[PDB]
Amino acid sequence: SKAFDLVVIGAGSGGLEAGWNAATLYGKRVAVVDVQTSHGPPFYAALGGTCVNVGCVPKKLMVTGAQYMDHLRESAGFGWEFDGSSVKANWKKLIAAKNEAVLDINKSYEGMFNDTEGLDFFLGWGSLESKNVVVVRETADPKSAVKERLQADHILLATGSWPQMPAIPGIEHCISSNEAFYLPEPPRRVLTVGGGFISVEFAGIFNAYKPPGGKVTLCYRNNLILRGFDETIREEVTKQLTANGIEIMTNENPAKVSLNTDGSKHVTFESGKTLDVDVVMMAIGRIPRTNDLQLGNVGVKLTPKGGVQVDEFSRTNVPNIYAIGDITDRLMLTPVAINEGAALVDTVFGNKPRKTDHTRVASAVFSIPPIGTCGLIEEVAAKEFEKVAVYMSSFTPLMHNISGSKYKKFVAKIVTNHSDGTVLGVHLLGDGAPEIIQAVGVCLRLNAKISDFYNTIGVHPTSAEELCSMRTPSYYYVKGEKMEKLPDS
Amino acid sequence: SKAFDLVVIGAGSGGLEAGWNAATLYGKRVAVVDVQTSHGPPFYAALGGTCVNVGCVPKKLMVTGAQYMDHLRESAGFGWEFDGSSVKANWKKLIAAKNEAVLDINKSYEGMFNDTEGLDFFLGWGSLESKNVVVVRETADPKSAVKERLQADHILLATGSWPQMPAIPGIEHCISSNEAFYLPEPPRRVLTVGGGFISVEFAGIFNAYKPPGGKVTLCYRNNLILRGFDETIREEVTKQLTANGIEIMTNENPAKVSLNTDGSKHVTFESGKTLDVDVVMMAIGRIPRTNDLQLGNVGVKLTPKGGVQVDEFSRTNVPNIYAIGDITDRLMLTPVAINEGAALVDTVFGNKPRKTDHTRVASAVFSIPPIGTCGLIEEVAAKEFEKVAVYMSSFTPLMHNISGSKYKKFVAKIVTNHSDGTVLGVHLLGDGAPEIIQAVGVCLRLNAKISDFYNTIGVHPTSAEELCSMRTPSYYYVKGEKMEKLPDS
Ligand SMILES: Cc1cc2nc3c(=O)[nH]c(=O)nc-3n(C[C@H](O)[C@H](O)[C@H](O)COP(=O)(O)OP(=O)(O)OC[C@H]3O[C@@H](n4cnc5c(N)ncnc54)[C@H](O)[C@@H]3O)c2cc1C
Ligand SMILES: Cc1cc2nc3c(=O)[nH]c(=O)nc-3n(C[C@H](O)[C@H](O)[C@H](O)COP(=O)(O)OP(=O)(O)OC[C@H]3O[C@@H](n4cnc5c(N)ncnc54)[C@H](O)[C@@H]3O)c2cc1C
C-alpha cells in the first residue's frame, strides 16, 4: 500500500481543484482516482469529471452549434442571401468535433498529473475499506481485482451524480443525457422528459439538428417548466421554445414505452395520450453517486434523499472523511464544486476554516434564448421580507424585430428588499444573459442596492443597460400581497 | 413670442432627457429645437439626436448585420453545410431595414411631444439673440428668416458635435460617417481614415458587405490604432482585423485626394504612396457644434479646443445658460449626455444640486470582435498610484478553435491599486465584452477589490468567468515602472 496526505475519489470539478490545490499550494502528497482516462462509453464521465466529459463543456459546444439555425434564418433580415434549400445540419460532424475537443482536455489532465510532483493519478474504482484506507479495484464490482490500496490521512468523496431513470415498463428503450452525447445520428422525433435545465437545453440542441420532417417534444409532469426560476422567465421560455417549433406538454408524464415495428418508440402517458418518437431522453433528475463507495464499511451517514450528509465545511460524521460537489445533493454546479474543494483544502491543510457561500450564486441555462440568474426569485423573497420591490423590463430588442424573431422578448428583473433597497435577485432572459449575470454576482456579494444600479451610467446600446435604467418599481409585495402601488400611507 | 421655463437647443440624447424631465417631473414649460424631424440628408442628425439618427442605434444594427459574415463561415465547424458560392450580402436591404427602424423612432418622439403637456417642439435653427431669448431661423445663416422668438428663463445648449474634415486638396471627394449611413451601394474598395472607434467600427461593417474582389483599408497616422484603450487590446484588435481581411496602414496619412475618370478616388499619402478606392471615409474626430449658435452675441466662453466651457454642474459663464453632451467636448457618449441632462434639471428645477461622475464610465467599441472597458488603463494608473497590479488572461476560447477563427483571442485585464486591491480598470476584447462590462461598471461604483471578483463563484461556461479566476498578478508597476515581480524592498 502507498501512503498519502489526501486521497480523492473522483477526478472531477471539485476533486481536481482539491487535489491540485493541496499538492501545489500546500505541498501535500495527493492521490486522485477515476474510472477512465477519456470520455465516453462505458462510463461516460472520466478524468476531468462530468462537466468536461458529458456536461457543461460539450453541451455548450452543442448549444453553440444549435444557435446557427437561428443565425442562418435571422441573417436574411440584415440582407444576407443564400440558397436556403442547400442548408443541412451535420450532427456527425458536430459530435466528432465535440469528441476531439473533449479528448484534448482529457489528454491535458493526464499531462497535468505527469508533470505535477506529489499529485498522482490512479486508474480504477475507489471505495472505502476502512476510515484510513481507500481500495482501488478494476471495476465497480466489489469482488474485482485489487489494483491499489491507498493509505490516507484524509479522504475526499467527490464522485458526483448520475442520471435518474423512472421505473416504468419499457425504460430499457429510453436514454439519458449520457447517451445523447453519443447518438450516431440526430433523431427526427425526440421526446425530452422533464422540465429542468438539461431537458430544456437538449430540446434546443435536437431542434436545430433534426432531419427534415422532424419534431421535438418536451414533457413535464407539472404545470410550468423550470421550477425554481423566475416565473415571468418560465412563462417566456415556454413561449419562445414553442415559437421555435418545440412542442411543450405540461401536466404530462410517461406511463409506458414500447417498440413499434419499424424500431421507433411508442410513448403512452398517464393521461392516455400517445406519442411516437425515435428517441426518448429522460432528464428527470440526477442522484448522488454513493452506491459504489462501500460507505457501509465505515458508516458515513447519508441524507434522506441519498446525498452524503455534510456540514457547512464539507465534513461527514467520520472525522478525516469529506464530501463535496454533486455527491452532497445541494447546488449541482461546477464552480460550486470547485469553490467547495478549495475551501475544504484551505480548512484542512491551511488550517484556516473556510466555507462555501451557497447563496447569491450566479448560474445560467443555455436554452435558446438563454437564462442568467443570481439570488432570490420574488416568491421566496416575499416570504422572508415584509416589503419587496420588483423592477421589470420586457420587450423585443430592435434587432430581433429586424431578424424576424419578434417572439424573442428580453426579460430583465431586479428584486429588492424595499426597506433599504438591497438587491435580492436579478433574473435575465435573452441573448448574452449568462455573460451579463457574472459581474452581477460580484455586485450582490458587495450588497449592492438598486440605486447603485440606476446611478451607474449605461453602456449603449446593449441589453445589459436595462439593468441600469429602472428607478421605479413595477410592483410590490407587502407581507406576501402582490400590488401595483404601495398604500398611500 | 412665446415664454418658457426652459429652452433646449438640440433635441438629442442630452436635450431630450433634460426637456422630458423638466416638463414631466417638475411641471415646467419646455421648448426643444431641432433642425429636422427625421434622419438623413441634408443635416443628418434630427429629433432623437446623433445617436438615434446617425450614431449608436443604426451603427449597432449595421455591425450586427456584419457579424453574419463570421457566423455563416464559423457555422461550418459545427456541422452546418450550405452552398457557400450562393452567399450574397445585400447592402441595400440592410440600409432599408436600418432606415425604417430609425424612422420609427423619429415618429415616436413626435407622439411624445403631442401627449405631453408643456413640452413643445420647434423646427429650425436655434441661436442666442440675447441672454433671455432663443431665436429660431429657417437655416444656419443668421440672416435667414425668423420662425420663432422664444423667451426663456433658462437656456440649454445641447447641439452635440460634427465630423472633423482635414484641410487637404480634394477633401470634397471624401465622406464622413454621416454619408456612410446612406451609400447607395456597398463600396468594393474603401479607405477609412483614423484609428479611433468610428473608423474601426465602419471598417468592420464595410468588410462584411463588400462586393466580390473587395478590400477595406484602414489608415492611421501613428504606429498603433485605438489610442486611449488598453495596449494588449489595441495590439489584438489590429491582429484580428488583419486576420479578417482588413489592411491596416499605420504611420500613413492622406495628403490629397483626386477624382479618377471612373468616379473612383485616387489617394496620395504624405509618404508618396497611393491607393485607389471607391470611398474615402474620414473619421479623424468630432468637434463641438458651436458655430451656428451665435455665442458671441451673449459672450458664452469657449475652451481652447472649441467646446463650451462649463463647471462640473454644466454651468457656463452666463448664469441662466447651460451646456451638456458633446458640445462640452468631454466624454462623447450618449448615456453620459443623458446623465448630464438629468443632473442639470434636478439642480436647476429641483434645487438639489447633482453632478455627473465622468470617472469609471463603462463603454464599448462595436468592432468585430467587440471591446468592453471601464476605468483606467495601466499606463494611466501607473502615474496616479505607487504600486499597481495587472491581472491578464488572453486565449482563444474553445468554440473558436472549432469555428476556425483561431485568431479570436479573448482578452481580460484587471488593473488594481495593489496597496489595497481596489479595482481601477477592467478591459475586455471578445464576443460579449460590451454586455459583460455593464455590471462591472456597477462594481467599480461600489469600490470592488480584486478579491471581490475572485471570491465570486463563476458562471460556467462563459468568457465572463475569467474575471473571477485571476488571483495572482501577471506583472506590476512600481513607481511608474513595469516589472514581472515586486522588488524585495
Ligand atoms: C448534461 C449536463 C449539463 C450540465 N451543465 C452545467 C452547466 O452548464 N454549468 C454548471 O455549472 N454545471 C453543469 N452541469 C453540472 C456539473 O457537471 C456538475 O455540477 C459538476 O460536474 C459536479 O462536479 P463534481 O466534482 O461533484 O463531480 P463530477 O464532475 O461529476 O466528477 C465525479 C467523477 O468521479 C468519478 N467516479 C465516480 N465513481 C467513482 C469511483 N467509485 N471511483 C473513482 N471515481 C469515480 C466519475 O467518473 C466522475 O469523473 C451539467 C451536468 C450535466 C449532466
Ligand atoms: C458614428 C457614431 C457612432 C456612435 N456610437 C456610440 C455608441 O456606440 N455609444 C455611445 O454611447 N455613443 C456613441 N456615439 C456618440 C453619441 O452619438 C453622442 O455622444 C451623443 O449623441 C451626444 O448627445 P448630445 O445630446 O450631446 O447631442 P446629439 O445627440 O448629437 O444631439 C444634438 C442635436 O442638436 C441638433 N442641432 C445642432 N445644431 C442645432 C441648431 N443650432 N439648432 C437646433 N438644433 C441643432 C442636431 O440636429 C442634433 O439632433 C456615436 C457617435 C457617432 C457619430
Author numbering:
A (entry chain A), B (entry chain B): 2 to 490
Would you copy out the relevant sentences from the publication that reported this structure?
T. brucei subspecies, along with all parasites of the order Kinetoplastida, possesses a novel thiol called trypanothione [N1, N8-bis(glutathionyl)spermidine]. Protection of the parasite against oxidative stress is achieved through the oxidation of the dithiol form of trypanothione (T(SH)2) into the disulphide form (T(S)2), followed by regeneration of T(SH)2 by the NADPH-dependent enzyme trypanothione reductase (TryR). However, the enzymes trypanothione reductase and glutathione reductase are highly specific for their respective disulphide substrates such that selective inhibition by small molecules can be readily achieved. Metabolism of trypanothione and other low molecular weight thiols has been established as an attractive target for drug discovery in several trypanosomatids and TryR from T. b. brucei has been specifically validated as a drug target, inter alia, by conditional knockout experiments.
Diffraction data was solved by molecular replacement using the TcTryR structure; the overall statistics of the final TbTryR model are given in Table 4. The overall structure of TbTryR is nearly identical to that of TcTryR (rmsd = 0.6 Å over 482 Cα atoms). All the catalytically important residues (Cys52, Cys57 and His461) and residues interacting with T(S)2, including those involved in binding the spermidine moiety (Leu17, Glu18, Trp21, Met 113, Ser109, Tyr110) are conserved between both structures. We have observed no significant differences between the TbTryR and TcTryR in terms of Km, sensitivity to inhibitors or in crystal structure.
